[PDB]
What does this fold into?
Amino acid sequence: MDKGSKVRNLRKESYWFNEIGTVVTIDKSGIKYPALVRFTKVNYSGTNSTNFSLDELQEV
Amino acid sequence: ASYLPSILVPLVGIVFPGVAMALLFLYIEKDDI
Amino acid sequence: DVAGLIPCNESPVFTKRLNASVVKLENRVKKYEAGSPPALALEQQIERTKQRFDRYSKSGLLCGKDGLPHLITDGRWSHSIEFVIPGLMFLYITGWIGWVGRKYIRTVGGDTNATEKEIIIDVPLALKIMSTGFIWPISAWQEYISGTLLADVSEITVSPR
Amino acid sequence: ENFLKYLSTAPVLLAAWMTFTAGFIIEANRFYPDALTFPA
Amino acid sequence: MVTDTQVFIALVLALISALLAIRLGTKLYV
Amino acid sequence: ATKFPKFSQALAQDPTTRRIWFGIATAHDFETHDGMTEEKLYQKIFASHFGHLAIIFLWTSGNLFHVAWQGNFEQWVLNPLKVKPIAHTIWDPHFGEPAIKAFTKGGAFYPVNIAYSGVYHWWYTIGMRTNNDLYLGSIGLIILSGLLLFAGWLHLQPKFSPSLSWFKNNESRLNHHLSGLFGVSSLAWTGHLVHVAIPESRGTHIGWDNFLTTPPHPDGLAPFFSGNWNVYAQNPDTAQHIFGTSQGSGSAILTFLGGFHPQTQSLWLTDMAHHHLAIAVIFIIAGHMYRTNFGIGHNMKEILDAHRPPGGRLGAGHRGLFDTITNSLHMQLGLALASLGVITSLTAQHMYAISPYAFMAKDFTTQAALYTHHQYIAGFLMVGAFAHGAIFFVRDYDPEANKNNVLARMLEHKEAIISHLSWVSLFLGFHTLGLYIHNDTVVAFGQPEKQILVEPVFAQFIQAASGKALYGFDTLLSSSESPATVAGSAIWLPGWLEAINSEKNDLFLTIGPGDFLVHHAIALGLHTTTLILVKGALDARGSKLMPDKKDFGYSFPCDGPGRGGTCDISAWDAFYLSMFWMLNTIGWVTFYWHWKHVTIWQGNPAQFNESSNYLMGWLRDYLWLNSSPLINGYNPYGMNSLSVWAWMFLFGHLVWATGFMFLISWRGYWQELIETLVWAHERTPLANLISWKDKPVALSIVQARLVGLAHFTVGYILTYAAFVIASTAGKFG
Amino acid sequence: TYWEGKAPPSKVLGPVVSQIPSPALGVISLICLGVGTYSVHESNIFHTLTADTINPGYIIGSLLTPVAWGTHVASWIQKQN
Amino acid sequence: SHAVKIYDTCIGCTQCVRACPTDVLEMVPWDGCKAGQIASAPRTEDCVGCKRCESACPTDFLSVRVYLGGETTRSMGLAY
Amino acid sequence: SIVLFHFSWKMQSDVWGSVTPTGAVSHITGGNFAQSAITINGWLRDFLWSQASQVIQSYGSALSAYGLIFLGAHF
Amino acid sequence: GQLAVIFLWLSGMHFHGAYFSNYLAWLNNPTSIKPSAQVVWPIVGQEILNADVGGNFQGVQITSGFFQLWRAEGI
Ligand code: CLA
Ligand code: CLA
Ligand code: CLA
Ligand code: CLA
Ligand code: CLA
Ligand code: CLA
Ligand code: CLA
Ligand SMILES: CC1=C(/C=C/C(C)=C/C=C/C(C)=C/C=C/C=C(C)/C=C/C=C(C)/C=C/C2=C(C)CCCC2(C)C)C(C)(C)CCC1
Ligand code: SF4
Ligand code: SF4
It folds into this structure.
């Protein structure tokens, strides 16, 4: 929704499913997955951020 | 009776497996059907 | 009584085992001069064996056909001494431990260096938490009825849930 | 500061605490040996 | 005490069954 | 076409030796065959089942023929306690003269194997007495197998192939396979027992030539129709009855004596007849439950849809399970395998305790062999049931058709199931191993009085409840002033109590701390195997590591070293891992059974009660002690009849070790070695003429794990079979 | 026949039972339970069962107890509506 | 040959293409991503199945996926 | 492992032993290596099974620690 | 550091020989006396591991050949 806002993940395949992550950047220039989110826990690959579509995030 | 095992055991343990393996080897690598 | 077990107080096999242990220790000590350090050690072993067997006889344990004590663990109060009483102690101690641990996890977890505080323990805070475990059952029940014990369904899961 | 912080590391504290637990367990078994069951 | 005739007829019935097995397998048709 | 495996174009085009290997391992997976439809799948399964029945009946006919032609069945039935049953002759040109002289036993005049199948006792019990009867049975079975093979061929013809709707006619199938396959079959078997087995046991020869004129009972169906069925229970065989002769014989054909026949120490034939009559009646009544174009009956889809508790704790209840079960062959295959495994375990548990066959329970080797055999088969069947359930989840589950279903809710809270199973497994393992090591340590320090010996109060209480007046519980049938005993006192209680309280039996063996610890070890094994299999089945459709696992199928090697490494991540790998635990737990069970029975047979059961509380006792008093007659099968001084079993013992050890070769060392090393081997072959004169047609490559990862597991299992089974047979037959215990 | 709510549709009871009013099923269930319990008690509880004490009537009555349970469930289902 | 699929979650960082040892993958112009590029697998006959591309993927779950299938001389990593 | 088994059995059966005042030699295992070390069953029986008596029977003596370690190493 | 560890190990071995061993008794009668330089505290009944090696001494029999080495050095 906005920079720095916490969002609950809804991507079923995501390692951070049902977890809270902070939005880093949002691309207003179209794009299918514009909302970059960062989570505290690192996934199995060691990364802690991913791009999601606004439909795949619960706002708060 | 008392003569058959001599006749059959060699056939079942040597001749039968030999021919069976020959035919299976032919068919596995036939390259057609 | 219980399952055809005769109390170890009147168990001939129990006394035979005691005699066998004592006599074998005596045979072992017969090859040392009286008063030698090995002789004193073996005599102390004999005394300890006698005390152990006497304590088992006086305790009220049930012997089998083999002469060894058997434990009744069906909840019988007369035999609680065998399993119920120690078990409670365990569930207390471990409980304490567990509770304390959980608290530490939930105390240092609200920091940026939460990971760094697990390899390196904050000994002052750690002891602060550890000293509070003697009331772990009450605190656990209070958290349970207060909803602060369990996390909501909104937590990590897998594709098929 | 640094030395005490090192003493606070996980392996050092685990070793110290396990040594302490083994010690008091050993002493308890030394003063009350062969404790199969609780005194009346 | 099975006589040679009994063994022979058992072998004949086994041969018939073997031929039927051959045909059934062939019909499973790989 | 175009190569060996037609059913796989991808494998057909494979230029390596892999094409051959997988061509063998994908043959029976009809679902994956190219150009395969549902109807052809079902018809091929039907024909394959016909073929399998033919194989079973030919195996049985072979057993009968070999016993008749080379056995000593007549000598055995004359004196069934002292002579040893014969399996078949040994025509081995590799034998030396001392071997021929050593393996000549029983009837003699040829080398021979002593049968441990117990088929002699079974055939004797069911009424057979002469080699002619065995031969006739074998000829009948050969004809039956030929008929089944012909039927299998016939039902593949275009005009005889049953339609797809026919296979999925669940109601009629259940009706017929309940009332007909189970009930009418049981009715026929009790008819046999009444007409043949019982008269043969009472010295009267009934056969095809005279069974139509000698009624099994003198009154002859007059009491049956008149309602005076009590007539058939009057005048049973008195305790002083010599089995197989009219000495002390009776006339009853349907009684409820209970207990055992004193002379044979087995069940009364009349009791078996009455049992099977009642079972046949119950099954025939049960088979009229579902409707089949006759108006009356139940429709199972409605039943399944209707059972959804209004409390909502089961969600949508059983809605949609009918479609999943009928449309999925893997789910019903798993259900059948599981039920068969439970029944195989039940047969193993009940045959030893309740001897059904005359003069068995004195042929110790046969009893041990049968128990071990059926327990291992039960373990295999259970593992297969769970494996096929995982397969069903992979390729047959439809999450949209099972929304909020009971089965879907199984996956919804899979984490809880797996975590609590893991907790139970850890609890049992930790504490059982701790108690065993505690006993080992205290006994090692010469202080056996400090052992933690826990009395199995609950099992002993159950034994007392059935009438075991040895633990002094005075409960239920063990106390006279109880409704249960008085109510049952008239019918079967006397014989049952006489059997249970007699210590010359396997009915409710006396138990102690050793039995307690071993039972908890068995519980650990079952729980851990179930944990592995259930985790595989539930995570088959995806995990956090592989959220799209279902897309890779049931059996794939891995998903690469990425994100931490994913070796053995597929459900097939869960089955492969669980096979080891199944073998381990079945081994524990069989070790427990064999050692307890060996100690009882030797006449010193105290040895087990003493030495089963610590592991060194198991290693010394059971394995080290009882293997002496086995490893001495052949020594530099000579050889004896057990030499074959010793050789098989070493062979099983070798195969078991060879399995480690495939289980430890993985493919890359072997592929790099085969590279050099290929180079060497290609660069050799006089051998460049001969060139492979299939490129030689190392075994695939999944294939290698399978082959290692197969070697492990074969070696395990062979070595334990050799041990259990040889020790028992060498010490007669 | 999948049903939600607190009471299943009457069609679950089958063509015949579904048409029976609740009081009739209740009385039938009480009669069946009484007869079945009385039969099960007369033989094997109040009197020991022997070879020559097998009464077909008592066997039928004993079988009637599951019928009593089914009829009481059906009566409740009919009662809810 | 193995089947290599690229999903629209890709962020076009090129890492999968770089990691590929058999030059199966490449970059093609695209508009659904910020970088304007997406990975493609035009020539999967040369894919060996090492799954290096998946290992070198930033996206939460493997915008590039490899599914092993029929094996040929090329995909079997055989110099013979 | 094979090297150590070879050394142990050979020394126990062919070198180590006792002598009498006359000079007679009595080895630990009676020289059973020549006719029993030529089969796998011979190694299994006369070396492992036969010489494992001490460990399995060491309970209740000063060597009981060796039996405990035997079991622990197996575990 | 490794050399320091090895020297500490040697120091421990020699000290346990001097204070906790029957080296003198073995010296007097090497054939009968069994070498031993380790003693176990009696805490759980593990004192059974204190074998009757000889020389009015009880301890765990050692097999490191340290006694023979020391004798060769004329200790
Ligand atoms: C009365 C009619 C009837 C009968 C006798 C059968 C019988 C059979 N059917 Mg058929 N079937 C029927 C009606 C019938 N069916 C109908 C109406 C349909 C249409 C829906 C089908 C559709 C159908 C299909 C599609 C298939 C069969 C199959 C089978 C076979 C199952 C395998 C087997 O050997 O059974 C096992 C028989 C037993 C008696 C074992 C009972 C199981 C218990 C657990 C064993 C316990 C026994 C005992 C206690 C152990 C001691 C014995 C020991 C001493 C030897 C069996 C021959 C299958 C087959 O193999 O085809 C050839 C198959 O694929 N049937
Ligand atoms: C599956 C059942 C079975 C089994 C395991 C055996 C096993 C044996 N038989 Mg017997 N046999 C059987 C059934 C069986 N028989 C039947 C039904 C008959 C009646 C014809 C005979 C008649 C018979 C004779 C006359 C002799 C043997 C002999 C032998 C032995 C040597 C093998 C041989 O020469 O075969 C010879 C067997 C045949 C020529 C007939 C084939 C046997 C069965 C029917 C084949 C079953 C195949 C099975 C379903 C699996 C097929 C798959 C396979 C191709 C991989 C061996 C112990 C010999 C012996 O005693 O040596 C000591 C011997 O002389 N058998
Ligand atoms: C304080 C930490 C803590 C707490 C509260 C729990 C609590 C629990 N664990 Mg976990 N666990 C822990 C640490 C902890 N565990 C560690 C460190 C490991 C790795 C060895 C595991 C491995 C583990 C497994 C594999 C399983 C559990 C399970 C369980 C549950 C049942 C109890 C049990 O089986 O314990 C088992 C405990 C162990 C096997 C090892 C515990 C080791 C020590 C005693 C705990 C750590 C103490 C630590 C020093 C805290 C210091 C605090 C200080 C700094 C102030 C329960 C929810 C089971 C479950 O899911 O049940 C549903 C289960 O299957 N646990
Ligand atoms: C219960 C056993 C069983 C059954 C019923 C089947 C059934 C089937 N298999 Mg499977 N299979 C089995 C065991 C079995 N298989 C085993 C153990 C293996 C090895 C792992 C395989 C490997 C395998 C492959 C690789 C393939 C099959 C295929 C088939 C199908 C037809 C094959 C056929 O008969 O063609 C015709 C074959 C014959 C007519 C030969 C019959 C053998 C005769 C009876 C031997 C008689 C010799 C006799 C003993 C000689 C004695 C002489 C003596 C006097 C010396 C059918 C679905 C094929 C299929 O359908 O795939 C979809 C296929 O491609 N199977
Ligand atoms: C009647 C029951 C039944 C039926 C119809 C099936 C049918 C099937 N199973 Mg299931 N299964 C069963 C029982 C059954 N299985 C049991 C009991 C287990 C537990 C072990 C399994 C475990 C299992 C697994 C884990 C898998 C299957 C799979 C399959 C499918 C392919 C099978 C195949 O290609 O065979 C190929 C046949 C072979 C490779 C032959 C191997 C025979 C054994 C292992 C070797 C024996 C060696 C011999 C004893 C050595 C002689 C000893 C001598 C040297 C001394 C097929 C639909 C596979 C699948 O994907 O299905 C979709 C699969 O992954 N099954
Ligand atoms: C003797 C061999 C052995 C042993 C002891 C285990 C033990 C275990 N396995 Mg493993 N396993 C084995 C062989 C073995 N396995 C083999 C050959 C296979 C086939 C590949 C498997 C496959 C397998 C799978 C697939 C699974 C297991 C599981 C388990 C657990 C079962 C529950 C249990 O007993 O918890 C109790 C734990 C034990 C008995 C382990 C020993 C613990 C000791 C006593 C503690 C010692 C602590 C001590 C201070 C160490 C100090 C070290 C220091 C000196 C350096 C446990 C960890 C299951 C599991 O994880 O359940 C949660 C599981 O899912 N195993
Ligand atoms: C280097 C080889 C070596 C070995 C293997 C041993 C082994 C042994 N010695 Mg010997 N000893 C050695 C060297 C060695 N010693 C040397 C060099 C000396 C000369 C000083 C001695 C002098 C000596 C005496 C005088 C005695 C022994 C005794 C013993 C036994 C009991 C030791 C014990 O647990 O006491 C208890 C020891 C402890 C509880 C250790 C303390 C625990 C610390 C505080 C843990 C700290 C770890 C720390 C957290 C790690 C991080 C570093 C931190 C400092 C920053 C044991 C068999 C005793 C014996 O045999 O009795 C009959 C005995 O009386 N030893
Ligand atoms: C994977 C899977 C699967 C499978 C599963 C399984 C395999 C399961 C198993 C299960 C089982 C395996 C179970 C068992 C059971 C058992 C039981 C359930 C028993 C019971 C019993 C009872 C209940 C009781 C009895 C009695 C009586 C009568 C009374 C008294 C006591 C006695 C005991 C006598 C399927 C396919 C589905 C699909 C999905 C997934
Ligand atoms: S590595 Fe992944 S994110 Fe990067 S270009 Fe390749 S597919 Fe896209
Ligand atoms: S699996 Fe390997 S060869 Fe295939 S596309 Fe990925 S990196 Fe390239």
The longest helix of chain H spans residues 15-19. Residues F 46, 49-50, 53, 167, 169, 172-173, 176-177, 180-182, 185, 343 surround chlorophyll A (ligand 1) (CB under 6 Å). The beta strands of chain H are 3-6, 26-29, 37-40, 64-67.
